[PDB]
């Protein structure tokens, strides 16, 4: 099957470390959904900076 790209907040609480490692490993963001509130995205610092560098026109 495909690597997970989503996880609930409830599950994330107890698997945060593994989740962080996965976002870093695949160099792809993971969405943390929230039953009531708003979802958040977790991504490696490297991917985050690269993204800002682009949106900044180098």
């Amino acid at each position: 099957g495909p690597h997970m790209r989503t996880i609930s907040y409830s599950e994330a609480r107890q698997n945060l470390s593994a989740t962080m490692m996965k976002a870093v490993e695949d160099h792809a963001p993971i969405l943390i959904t929230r039953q009531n509130g708003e979802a958040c995205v977790l991504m490696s610092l490297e991917e985050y900076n690269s993204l800002e560098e682009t949106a900044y026109l180098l």
């Binding site: 800002e52 949106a55 900044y56 026109l57």
Partner: protein
């Protein structure tokens, strides 16, 4: 609300006009919707950052985006075609 275009977006628009009428209709629908609700609705409206602050982006196709800004008086169209 008035429609102001740059040479870039105007060329983009005419390109579609003489290239793919299907895309034209999509652009018009988005413009008409943005005109109604500038920051909400069709095309998954998205606010842009940094050097693009103030502008918004909506989906014409998975590739082409309607980029625009809004003043107290009109709709500024920055683009309606994605370029390589």
């Amino acid at each position: 609300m008035k429609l102001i275009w740059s040479e870039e977006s105007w060329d983009d628009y005419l390109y579609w006009q003489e290239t793919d009428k299907r895309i034209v209709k999509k652009i018009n629908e988005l413009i008409k919707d943005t005109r109604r609700t500038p920051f909400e609705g069709k095309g998954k409206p998205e606010p842009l950052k940094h050097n693009l602050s103030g502008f918004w982006s909506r989906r014409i196709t998975e590739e082409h985006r309607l980029v625009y800004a809004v003043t107290d008086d009109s709709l500024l169209i920055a683009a309606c075609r994605y370029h390589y």
